[PDB]
Amino acid sequence: LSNERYQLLSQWPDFTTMYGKDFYYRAHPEDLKKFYDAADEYYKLYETVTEFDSLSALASQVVPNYAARRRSTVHPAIGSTVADGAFTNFLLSKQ
Amino acid sequence: DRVLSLPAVSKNQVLENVFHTAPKAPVEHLEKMVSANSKVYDALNLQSKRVLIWQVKPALF
């Protein structure tokens, strides 16, 4: 999933081609501060999508809630479609 | 009142309207993407000392 987000930071326009002083001084002083904030934002997004040593601890936030649903008192592989299909056998037979 | 014939906008107010934003260094794009691609090297290379390939696709032994 991090690869699908890294692929859209791959398609980010090269803002460093507009760092020259012929773009600094032709531009509105507030549209240049927005441009320098949008360049500081890409480095925030890119330095956290390449923090791949953080994915191994995000996987441990998914494991314990999944593993408790598998500790079912009925069966590990039980679900609603089977347990509804086995209520049809239980209800539509005699008592 | 000779001071009222001088330009009323200060030398300070020129230097803060001409030099309004601290300009972006040429090298701050290199040394910020390089430190972030050094994490792309670490996790995803196959020669790194900390690859994620044995953590995400565990080896069949």
mmCIF file of C-alpha atoms in Angstrom:
data_model
loop_
_atom_site.group_PDB
_atom_site.id
_atom_site.type_symbol
_atom_site.label_atom_id
_atom_site.label_comp_id
_atom_site.label_asym_id
_atom_site.label_seq_id
_atom_site.Cartn_x
_atom_site.Cartn_y
_atom_site.Cartn_z
ATOM 1 C CA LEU A 1 0.000 0.000 0.000
ATOM 2 C CA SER A 2 2.947 2.328 0.577
ATOM 3 C CA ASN A 3 3.955 1.598 -2.974
ATOM 4 C CA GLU A 4 0.638 2.899 -4.259
ATOM 5 C CA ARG A 5 1.211 6.146 -2.367
ATOM 6 C CA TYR A 6 4.829 6.420 -3.407
ATOM 7 C CA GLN A 7 3.705 6.088 -7.013
ATOM 8 C CA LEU A 8 1.713 9.289 -6.707
ATOM 9 C CA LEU A 9 4.595 11.126 -5.107
ATOM 10 C CA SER A 10 6.475 10.006 -8.202
ATOM 11 C CA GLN A 11 4.142 12.122 -10.310
ATOM 12 C CA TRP A 12 4.719 15.367 -8.395
ATOM 13 C CA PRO A 13 5.885 18.332 -10.476
ATOM 14 C CA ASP A 14 9.488 19.390 -10.083
ATOM 15 C CA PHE A 15 9.084 22.481 -7.973
ATOM 16 C CA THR A 16 12.842 22.984 -7.787
ATOM 17 C CA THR A 17 12.836 24.155 -11.387
ATOM 18 C CA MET A 18 11.165 27.338 -10.095
ATOM 19 C CA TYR A 19 13.610 28.183 -7.330
ATOM 20 C CA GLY A 20 15.489 30.752 -9.375
ATOM 21 C CA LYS A 21 15.368 34.442 -8.636
ATOM 22 C CA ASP A 22 13.584 35.164 -11.882
ATOM 23 C CA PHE A 23 10.623 33.349 -10.355
ATOM 24 C CA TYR A 24 11.240 34.831 -6.910
ATOM 25 C CA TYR A 25 10.933 38.424 -8.020
ATOM 26 C CA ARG A 26 8.297 38.094 -10.674
ATOM 27 C CA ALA A 27 5.896 36.420 -8.275
ATOM 28 C CA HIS A 28 3.471 37.785 -5.737
ATOM 29 C CA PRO A 29 5.023 37.634 -2.252
ATOM 30 C CA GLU A 30 2.156 35.507 -0.946
ATOM 31 C CA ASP A 31 2.086 33.136 -3.906
ATOM 32 C CA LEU A 32 5.774 32.587 -3.381
ATOM 33 C CA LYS A 33 5.357 31.753 0.286
ATOM 34 C CA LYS A 34 2.667 29.288 -0.711
ATOM 35 C CA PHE A 35 5.039 27.796 -3.252
ATOM 36 C CA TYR A 36 7.773 27.422 -0.657
ATOM 37 C CA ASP A 37 5.267 25.833 1.703
ATOM 38 C CA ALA A 38 4.104 23.405 -0.959
ATOM 39 C CA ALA A 39 7.707 22.384 -1.472
ATOM 40 C CA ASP A 40 8.243 21.875 2.252
ATOM 41 C CA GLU A 41 5.089 19.779 2.276
ATOM 42 C CA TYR A 42 6.351 17.352 -0.347
ATOM 43 C CA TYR A 43 9.375 16.656 1.787
ATOM 44 C CA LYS A 44 7.034 15.947 4.650
ATOM 45 C CA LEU A 45 5.003 13.507 2.581
ATOM 46 C CA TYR A 46 7.993 11.886 0.931
ATOM 47 C CA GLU A 47 10.055 11.398 4.061
ATOM 48 C CA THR A 48 7.196 9.564 5.743
ATOM 49 C CA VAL A 49 6.158 7.333 2.857
ATOM 50 C CA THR A 50 9.733 6.051 2.686
ATOM 51 C CA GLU A 51 9.778 5.356 6.408
ATOM 52 C CA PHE A 52 9.442 1.646 5.735
ATOM 53 C CA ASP A 53 10.814 0.690 9.145
ATOM 54 C CA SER A 54 7.518 1.928 10.545
ATOM 55 C CA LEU A 55 5.408 -0.549 8.620
ATOM 56 C CA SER A 56 6.399 -3.446 10.841
ATOM 57 C CA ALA A 57 4.854 -1.794 13.878
ATOM 58 C CA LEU A 58 1.720 -0.813 12.015
ATOM 59 C CA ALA A 59 1.209 -4.471 11.258
ATOM 60 C CA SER A 60 1.107 -5.150 15.000
ATOM 61 C CA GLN A 61 -1.894 -2.875 15.310
ATOM 62 C CA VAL A 62 -3.808 -5.117 12.929
ATOM 63 C CA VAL A 63 -2.764 -8.506 14.391
ATOM 64 C CA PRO A 64 -4.283 -8.588 17.937
ATOM 65 C CA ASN A 65 -7.824 -7.643 16.946
ATOM 66 C CA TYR A 66 -7.737 -10.132 14.082
ATOM 67 C CA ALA A 67 -6.344 -12.860 16.302
ATOM 68 C CA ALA A 68 -9.141 -12.391 18.837
ATOM 69 C CA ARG A 69 -11.786 -12.862 16.164
ATOM 70 C CA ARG A 70 -10.121 -16.159 15.365
ATOM 71 C CA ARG A 71 -10.381 -17.217 19.006
ATOM 72 C CA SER A 72 -14.065 -17.799 18.504
ATOM 73 C CA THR A 73 -15.913 -20.153 20.794
ATOM 74 C CA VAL A 74 -17.611 -21.721 17.766
ATOM 75 C CA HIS A 75 -14.856 -22.239 15.180
ATOM 76 C CA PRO A 76 -11.825 -20.337 13.855
ATOM 77 C CA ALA A 77 -13.311 -20.305 10.341
ATOM 78 C CA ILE A 78 -16.881 -19.441 11.236
ATOM 79 C CA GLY A 79 -18.637 -16.541 9.558
ATOM 80 C CA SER A 80 -22.078 -15.104 9.067
ATOM 81 C CA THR A 81 -22.953 -16.789 5.770
ATOM 82 C CA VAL A 82 -22.274 -20.258 7.145
ATOM 83 C CA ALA A 83 -23.915 -19.564 10.494
ATOM 84 C CA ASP A 84 -26.990 -18.179 8.744
ATOM 85 C CA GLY A 85 -27.099 -21.184 6.456
ATOM 86 C CA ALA A 86 -26.968 -23.426 9.494
ATOM 87 C CA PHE A 87 -29.776 -21.509 11.148
ATOM 88 C CA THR A 88 -31.960 -22.349 8.163
ATOM 89 C CA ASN A 89 -31.261 -26.012 8.870
ATOM 90 C CA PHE A 90 -31.853 -25.504 12.580
ATOM 91 C CA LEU A 91 -35.025 -23.453 12.332
ATOM 92 C CA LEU A 92 -36.684 -25.155 9.360
ATOM 93 C CA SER A 93 -36.411 -28.562 10.958
ATOM 94 C CA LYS A 94 -38.615 -29.778 13.783
ATOM 95 C CA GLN A 95 -37.710 -28.048 17.102
ATOM 96 C CA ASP B 1 11.195 70.154 6.777
ATOM 97 C CA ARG B 2 13.838 68.747 4.472
ATOM 98 C CA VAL B 3 13.027 65.302 5.844
ATOM 99 C CA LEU B 4 9.622 65.483 4.177
ATOM 100 C CA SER B 5 11.328 65.564 0.788
ATOM 101 C CA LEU B 6 13.277 62.390 1.476
ATOM 102 C CA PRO B 7 11.581 59.130 0.445
ATOM 103 C CA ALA B 8 9.282 58.229 3.318
ATOM 104 C CA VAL B 9 9.661 54.498 2.816
ATOM 105 C CA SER B 10 12.645 53.482 4.904
ATOM 106 C CA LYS B 11 15.729 51.596 3.867
ATOM 107 C CA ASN B 12 14.489 48.951 6.274
ATOM 108 C CA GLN B 13 11.117 48.728 4.547
ATOM 109 C CA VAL B 14 12.842 48.262 1.216
ATOM 110 C CA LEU B 15 15.009 45.445 2.530
ATOM 111 C CA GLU B 16 12.011 43.671 4.000
ATOM 112 C CA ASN B 17 9.851 44.034 0.893
ATOM 113 C CA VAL B 18 12.586 43.048 -1.542
ATOM 114 C CA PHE B 19 14.018 40.243 0.595
ATOM 115 C CA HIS B 20 10.686 39.082 1.960
ATOM 116 C CA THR B 21 11.269 35.303 1.997
ATOM 117 C CA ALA B 22 14.477 33.439 2.737
ATOM 118 C CA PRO B 23 15.245 31.802 -0.616
ATOM 119 C CA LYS B 24 15.454 28.065 -1.113
ATOM 120 C CA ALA B 25 18.990 26.714 -1.262
ATOM 121 C CA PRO B 26 20.035 24.686 -4.337
ATOM 122 C CA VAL B 27 21.429 21.907 -2.185
ATOM 123 C CA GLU B 28 18.489 21.534 0.182
ATOM 124 C CA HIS B 29 16.659 19.455 -2.400
ATOM 125 C CA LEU B 30 19.605 17.114 -2.778
ATOM 126 C CA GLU B 31 20.356 16.554 0.897
ATOM 127 C CA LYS B 32 16.654 16.122 1.733
ATOM 128 C CA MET B 33 15.816 13.635 -1.000
ATOM 129 C CA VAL B 34 19.098 11.782 -0.521
ATOM 130 C CA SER B 35 18.396 11.168 3.157
ATOM 131 C CA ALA B 36 14.933 9.973 2.171
ATOM 132 C CA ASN B 37 16.190 7.750 -0.613
ATOM 133 C CA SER B 38 18.718 6.302 1.797
ATOM 134 C CA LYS B 39 15.668 4.769 3.454
ATOM 135 C CA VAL B 40 14.526 3.492 0.059
ATOM 136 C CA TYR B 41 17.963 1.954 -0.299
ATOM 137 C CA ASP B 42 17.883 0.406 3.157
ATOM 138 C CA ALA B 43 14.513 -1.226 2.979
ATOM 139 C CA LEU B 44 14.330 -2.201 -0.644
ATOM 140 C CA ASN B 45 17.660 -3.038 -2.218
ATOM 141 C CA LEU B 46 18.670 -6.754 -1.645
ATOM 142 C CA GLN B 47 22.203 -5.753 -0.686
ATOM 143 C CA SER B 48 21.338 -3.585 2.290
ATOM 144 C CA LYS B 49 21.996 -4.740 5.797
ATOM 145 C CA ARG B 50 18.348 -4.039 6.695
ATOM 146 C CA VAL B 51 16.221 -5.261 3.820
ATOM 147 C CA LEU B 52 12.535 -5.793 4.256
ATOM 148 C CA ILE B 53 12.489 -8.775 1.907
ATOM 149 C CA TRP B 54 12.799 -11.324 4.702
ATOM 150 C CA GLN B 55 10.258 -9.495 6.786
ATOM 151 C CA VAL B 56 7.541 -9.149 4.169
ATOM 152 C CA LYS B 57 8.054 -12.349 2.160
ATOM 153 C CA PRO B 58 9.388 -14.929 4.602
ATOM 154 C CA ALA B 59 11.681 -17.494 3.064
ATOM 155 C CA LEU B 60 10.637 -21.077 2.479
ATOM 156 C CA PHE B 61 13.260 -23.256 4.082
#
